[PDB]
């Protein structure tokens, strides 16, 4: 039995066991109990907390790679941004601050994260509030400590 | 070690890049098919059996290792998720053609014709230069089937 | 002692009990209590639905694949197909809809199969319709929701 | 990083094949053995048993821990199931002759003779390059006599 | 025997130096280029993706390999870090100018404009010929902007 | 799986363990548990304890160069100087005698560093003294056996 | 092919050379130099980076290869070795001068002043004209510093 | 890793490994573990038996010139030589017999060593006895068969 934390878009975790530690991205979307397998996106949550899109028939050894926790989530289209420079692809539509500061690696209560828009002012994205990723361009993201 | 790659755009027009590094990073790549801002550009590795992996501007990719000699690299800032054939597949840019697509089924796009496959419905033919937009609510279902006279 | 659950063509359960926790092909057949061996096929029911075909002489550890339930049935040839993307064998020349809707791991009642034609319309499998599978070509099926 | 196994057709004809993955899916083994549509082939391994495992389009398969080098790749929509010498077999086209058989027992087929043993009936004998039709009704029986002087 | 490269100043005002050696060190560079004492200047391989990399004086590079043809040597006491486009670079000098900085982004400088990114703040452009003090507290971030009319 | 001792400032050592042989230096700083990737400098040190720094996106193969210590800290700036002769940067405006002997591979007991000013007189930096690496020209020590 | 190269002696004195063969021995340019016995002379090319490499009399030197155009021959028993602006040299005679000493250090000897450098102790200037006994226990590490007043 | 052996005054070899095959002259002593490095002499050992000083910034293609043998001493001032005509290079003002038969590629054992002085006698020297080689002049050895 192989312990993974199969993550959603909120970052909430559900531990799965596989039977298998080299599975398909069928094999970890069945074992989340998703349906149809088709309707969802798997992406492998990287040690720095990069996020690795995986194909349904792309094998994938959690082991060699050091990974221990999957996202899994309906998704038809990937939004590409960047949080602290790290290059990311989300599944949602939405993403909220907190997800973000998350991903960033921070303390979300500590720090605040902005759009940070070269040449004009930068806008905030509250813990809470869903930011449309379907905005025109590649959002950049940063966090900022909260003093 | 001068590597040479294949750089193919949204259109499958190729570009021959050499690369100083067998191993380059997706900026690396980027830079080197002579795209900026980088950070506005999309790169997956082409796999030998026609998968598009994506790659991060800081992901080390070993070509000889993967046996990865053709890159995409196109301007993107949204993935589309679609099937060809039924393989796992994503497109940097919101319009694809079917002679993509019957190309990225491995398939001679003259003998061939792709649809859109609509589970109880009909199907949807996508003509070779027909611009197909893969922005439709749901995930895009697409089968090529031998045209008896090549058209 | 391992309890597995052994399937017919109707997927119709008997509970066998067994000695042995890897077992060949030929004693599941002859502890399900069906003779003669070579007559009938084997097929472990995996995890994610997949049948995978065991051989009268090829050990099989249920517990290290976590296979319980097993699908014996009297076959002398396997008809190919795909429910919902998955490569499947079926050891009779017929399969009916709601055993397809089984098979895709759907609600049959909530849900509805097609046998899906590229180009041309779809047909609609009825819960009870017995599907040919002899027929030319690999079947394609595929379950829609039915709203 | 190659790692090389031979693929062989319905005839029995070989093809080299390098992968870039010792545990290839049965996916990427038709996609590099240059077969389409990917869905129309059934892929078999050929263990070093003689036994032919059929394998499926996502199942991983790592080819060094079984130990093999040789695999099956046909069109197939359906697969006949028979026995030679004893061996739980599949084969993914409905012909299948002689010489093939007598290949799958491991014998010399110059030297034997394979027979479809029909149970208190004549057999009937099989032809080294007769193709044998596997659709008929019942698992088919062959088996190997020498063909001794 | 000759290999040449173009070595550049912290202006960016270039000089073509033949080496007899296509894998020098750091020292003979800055020989090779008339710079004294070689203790007080940088040297910086300027490569193909417009990445600064520091030489040391003992340190042997393979311009060939590395597809170098450009350096950068300039007297520097201390490197200040700062990043253009989110490239890692550092400067052997105190002040960068825009155009300076729109050149290592590989960018048009007449096409563009170069902001000084403050999160959560407003932004401080800089002009092609100011000179930018990067000894302000804090690792500078500049991005650049199409000067689309 | 590689493990490396990455140093910061003071030369305290932490063991870290990489899942790649050929890190890059961000992926160096995400392991180190350091945060904004963006305000670290990352120094690999060399067998001959000359330190190469390394960018957040420049691959380092740590068996090819034989670099098993890596060097990360806070840095805005990096700082110029010679030890023994050796052509060096330090991250920190401040570096010790201590630290110095360290780099010079001497036995720091057993040695004395100076600041060697030609024509003038030379100034000992002692064990805990804090020198300022921000001074005006480029720092030179030389480290004498302390007879 | 006369091969012109400038032979300098251990006060920095040059005279010009025209050799037959582009790749001398180190005999052969000890020979034209006009000194004998060859067996007491140690020749050093003077490399572009000033930098002295002491050359045998049987070892062959591509002029042409290295950039070499200065040549030093010096009668020689014995070579010393000594550190100038961090540079390792060797010096064939017990004797340098100042101006020579910053001659090696490729700067201006009018506008600098070389000094030994003397770890933790004070430092030693040589003037100009001084001659310095190389001859001194230790390896003698020669610093030059810009000298304010040209005087 | 690169072998080269590195011999002292005696002639006794230590085996060193090498990450660079072209080193500098302050590599081979770092490595070779002698410091301070601006008190050693670093003497590639060519095939032809003839000792090549390189300086400590001097790059050195071990590979291209067939070098694998290195001679690292202390040393401030180097003696001039010839032993059976060969030009020589001595870092330590002493070297004993056995050392000049070894150079000169002969026996030791079966061969005798002489200081060879025109017109007047020619002192031999032992096996261990250590010559100085800072009498005046330039020293001329030639090595007899020892019937
Ligand atoms: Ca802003
Ligand atoms: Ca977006
Ligand atoms: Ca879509
Ligand atoms: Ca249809
Ligand atoms: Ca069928
Ligand atoms: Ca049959
Ligand atoms: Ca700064
Ligand atoms: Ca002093
Ligand atoms: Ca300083
Ligand atoms: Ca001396
Ligand atoms: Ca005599
Ligand atoms: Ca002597």
Do not use: C
């Amino acid at each position: 039995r192989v312990a993974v934390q199969v993550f959603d878009e909120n970052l909430n975790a559900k531990d799965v066991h596989l039977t298998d530690p080299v599975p398909t991205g069928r094999q970890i979307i069945k074992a989340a109990g998703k349906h149809p397998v088709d309707d969802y996106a798997v992406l492998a949550w990287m040690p720095d907390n990069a996020l690795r899109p995986l194909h349904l028939d792309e094998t994938f050894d959690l082991r060699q790679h050091g990974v221990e926790r999957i996202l899994v989530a309906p998704s038809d289209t990937l939004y590409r941004f960047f949080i602290d420079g790290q290059d990311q692809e989300w599944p949602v539509r939405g993403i909220t601050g907190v997800v973000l500061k998350t991903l960033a690696g921070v303390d979300p209560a500590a720090f605040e994260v902005f759009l940070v828009i070269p040449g004009d002012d930068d806008i905030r994205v509250e813990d809470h509030e869903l930011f449309d990723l379907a905005r025109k361009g590649v959002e950049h993201f940063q966090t900022v400590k909260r003093k």
